[PDB]
Scaffold this active site. Sequence first.
Site, PDB file in Angstrom:
ATOM      1  N   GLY A 129      55.476  77.511  42.577  1.00  0.00           N
ATOM      2  CA  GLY A 129      55.875  78.466  41.556  1.00  0.00           C
ATOM      3  C   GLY A 129      55.218  79.779  41.915  1.00  0.00           C
ATOM      4  O   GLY A 129      55.391  80.266  43.035  1.00  0.00           O
ATOM      5  N   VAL A 130      54.413  80.326  41.004  1.00  0.00           N
ATOM      6  CA  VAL A 130      53.683  81.569  41.243  1.00  0.00           C
ATOM      7  C   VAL A 130      52.281  81.437  40.644  1.00  0.00           C
ATOM      8  O   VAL A 130      52.143  80.990  39.506  1.00  0.00           O
ATOM      9  CB  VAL A 130      54.459  82.812  40.738  1.00  0.00           C
TER      10      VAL A 130
ATOM     11  N   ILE B 104      48.533  86.137  43.210  1.00  0.00           N
ATOM     12  CA  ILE B 104      47.845  85.559  44.370  1.00  0.00           C
ATOM     13  C   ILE B 104      48.918  85.201  45.403  1.00  0.00           C
ATOM     14  O   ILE B 104      48.821  85.604  46.559  1.00  0.00           O
ATOM     15  CB  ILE B 104      46.968  84.326  44.003  1.00  0.00           C
ATOM     16  N   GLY B 105      49.903  84.415  44.987  1.00  0.00           N
ATOM     17  CA  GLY B 105      50.979  84.010  45.880  1.00  0.00           C
ATOM     18  C   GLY B 105      52.183  83.420  45.188  1.00  0.00           C
ATOM     19  O   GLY B 105      52.128  83.101  44.001  1.00  0.00           O
ATOM     20  N   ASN B 106      53.275  83.282  45.954  1.00  0.00           N
ATOM     21  CA  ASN B 106      54.559  82.721  45.533  1.00  0.00           C
ATOM     22  C   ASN B 106      54.947  81.608  46.513  1.00  0.00           C
ATOM     23  O   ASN B 106      54.688  81.728  47.710  1.00  0.00           O
ATOM     24  CB  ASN B 106      55.641  83.810  45.564  1.00  0.00           C
TER      25      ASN B 106
ATOM     26  N   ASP C 193      50.059  65.775  49.188  1.00  0.00           N
ATOM     27  CA  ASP C 193      50.250  67.116  49.739  1.00  0.00           C
ATOM     28  C   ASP C 193      48.912  67.682  50.221  1.00  0.00           C
ATOM     29  O   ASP C 193      48.626  68.859  50.023  1.00  0.00           O
ATOM     30  CB  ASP C 193      50.943  68.053  48.716  1.00  0.00           C
TER      31      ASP C 193
HETATM   32  C1  QQA Z   1      52.542  80.725  50.139  1.00  0.00           C
HETATM   33  N1  QQA Z   1      51.150  80.896  49.665  1.00  0.00           N
HETATM   34  C2  QQA Z   1      50.677  82.295  49.653  1.00  0.00           C
HETATM   35  C3  QQA Z   1      49.345  82.363  48.876  1.00  0.00           C
HETATM   36  N2  QQA Z   1      48.390  81.304  49.200  1.00  0.00           N
HETATM   37  C4  QQA Z   1      47.031  81.453  48.803  1.00  0.00           C
HETATM   38  C5  QQA Z   1      46.291  82.494  49.370  1.00  0.00           C
HETATM   39  C6  QQA Z   1      44.952  82.688  49.023  1.00  0.00           C
HETATM   40  C7  QQA Z   1      44.363  81.818  48.097  1.00  0.00           C
HETATM   41  N3  QQA Z   1      43.065  81.937  47.711  1.00  0.00           N
HETATM   42  C8  QQA Z   1      42.443  81.154  46.645  1.00  0.00           C
HETATM   43  C9  QQA Z   1      42.746  81.909  45.323  1.00  0.00           C
HETATM   44  N4  QQA Z   1      42.579  81.100  44.116  1.00  0.00           N
HETATM   45  C10 QQA Z   1      43.340  80.043  43.730  1.00  0.00           C
HETATM   46  C11 QQA Z   1      44.587  79.672  44.246  1.00  0.00           C
HETATM   47  C12 QQA Z   1      45.228  78.545  43.722  1.00  0.00           C
HETATM   48  C13 QQA Z   1      44.655  77.783  42.696  1.00  0.00           C
HETATM   49  N5  QQA Z   1      45.307  76.691  42.217  1.00  0.00           N
HETATM   50  O1  QQA Z   1      44.714  75.825  41.291  1.00  0.00           O
HETATM   51  O2  QQA Z   1      46.432  76.393  42.557  1.00  0.00           O
HETATM   52  C14 QQA Z   1      43.403  78.207  42.224  1.00  0.00           C
HETATM   53  N6  QQA Z   1      42.685  77.610  41.243  1.00  0.00           N
HETATM   54  N7  QQA Z   1      42.801  79.298  42.743  1.00  0.00           N
HETATM   55  N8  QQA Z   1      45.100  80.818  47.567  1.00  0.00           N
HETATM   56  C15 QQA Z   1      46.395  80.611  47.883  1.00  0.00           C
HETATM   57  C16 QQA Z   1      47.053  79.472  47.207  1.00  0.00           C
HETATM   58  C17 QQA Z   1      46.657  78.165  47.511  1.00  0.00           C
HETATM   59  C18 QQA Z   1      47.265  77.070  46.889  1.00  0.00           C
HETATM   60  C19 QQA Z   1      48.279  77.291  45.952  1.00  0.00           C
HETATM   61 CL1  QQA Z   1      49.077  75.961  45.139  1.00  0.00          CL
HETATM   62  C20 QQA Z   1      48.683  78.592  45.638  1.00  0.00           C
HETATM   63  C21 QQA Z   1      48.068  79.679  46.267  1.00  0.00           C
HETATM   64 CL2  QQA Z   1      48.636  81.274  45.813  1.00  0.00          CL
HETATM   65  C22 QQA Z   1      48.770  80.189  49.871  1.00  0.00           C
HETATM   66  O3  QQA Z   1      47.995  79.290  50.157  1.00  0.00           O
HETATM   67  C23 QQA Z   1      50.196  79.974  50.319  1.00  0.00           C
END
Ligand code: QQA
EC number: 2.7.11.26
Length: 344
Positions: free
Chosen positions: A32-33, A26-28, A141
């Site tokens: 973390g990742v 999903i992302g870095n 945050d």
């Molecule tokens: C630098 N980055 C690039 C990617 N990015 C991002 C892009 C799309 C989505 N879409 C939602 C997908 N689902 C998801 C995501 C996180 C969690 N979580 O619990 O952390 C759960 N349960 N689900 N999220 C994320 C995201 C949001 C919060 C966190 Cl910490 C980590 C990520 Cl990768 C970013 O916001 C910023």
Amino acid sequence: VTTVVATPGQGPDRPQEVSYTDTKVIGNGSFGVVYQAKLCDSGELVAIKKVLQDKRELQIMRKLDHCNIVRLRYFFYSSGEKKDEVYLNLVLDYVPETVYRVARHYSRAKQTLPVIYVKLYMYQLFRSLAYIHSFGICHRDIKPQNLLLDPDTAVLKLCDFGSAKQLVRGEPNVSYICSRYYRAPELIFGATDYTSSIDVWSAGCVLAELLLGQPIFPGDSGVDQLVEIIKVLGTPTREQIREMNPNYTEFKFPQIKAHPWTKVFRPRTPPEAIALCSRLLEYTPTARLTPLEACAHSFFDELRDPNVKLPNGRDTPALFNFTTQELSSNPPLATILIPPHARI
Ligand SMILES: CN1CCN(c2ccc(NCCNc3ccc([N+](=O)[O-])c(N)n3)nc2-c2ccc(Cl)cc2Cl)C(=O)C1
């Protein structure tokens, strides 16, 4: 394709085999990742957050249970990119979008996020904050990227508890915390005795950003972040500076007039949204509304209407199933928060 791991997870301490597939990144970042995956047994999508352990997310995530907070399903230790390092994996509920991405879609399309969604997303954010603040837990945050979203149901889930901490009176806390744009001014003034009202300031920044279509305080550094706040709120007074940090005494800054709240936002902006925003983005931390008081604000009255529906036609998600723990800060607000049609 199928990864099989053994893991205890939330609830009872009982490690079990969990098999998942369709693993995708999903992302870095600082967190973390985060990976997307599907649990084989149920076919349910999950988010796996792999973090390197060196130098309280797990501890907090095992205790939290709320509809507006991403739940921890399982947790496990594993190997990773770095040999002989230990990595913690958090198997969380998957939510497809973020408030950042949804707000960015509307901005790129020359639109402001519809008020119905601004109401729904902010209410659920304040509701998740009322719940964590009832345990003394401050997120530290709050930002659009950490507000997960399901577009179809309009369900919001607060995530990323890597900066989160239980604040105790007497114990100092780091001032350099929160993503700069959403950093409360007490933190900029170096306050170590701050409270959970730093998340309310950060939520006020998220609200203002959804009404403007861009961050309200886009500072290029800790010092310039305060300049952006002063350009809207005006120069803080001595009383306000003492309230923000009692040990700061050296602030010499020119007299800047406050930008009236009606002029900050565009003319179509609903007055109640502006009114709520003015009660969140206050210099004095104690003057800010609590999350539970923000939920009970007149800006969220449409959500308490018996005939309210989402634009797609679906019912709104659950908004009034408040627990006693959640109403702790102000039990009498249950009369406003739980409408006539939602009681019992
Ligand atoms: C630098 N980055 C690039 C990617 N990015 C991002 C892009 C799309 C989505 N879409 C939602 C997908 N689902 C998801 C995501 C996180 C969690 N979580 O619990 O952390 C759960 N349960 N689900 N999220 C994320 C995201 C949001 C919060 C966190 Cl910490 C980590 C990520 Cl990768 C970013 O916001 C910023």
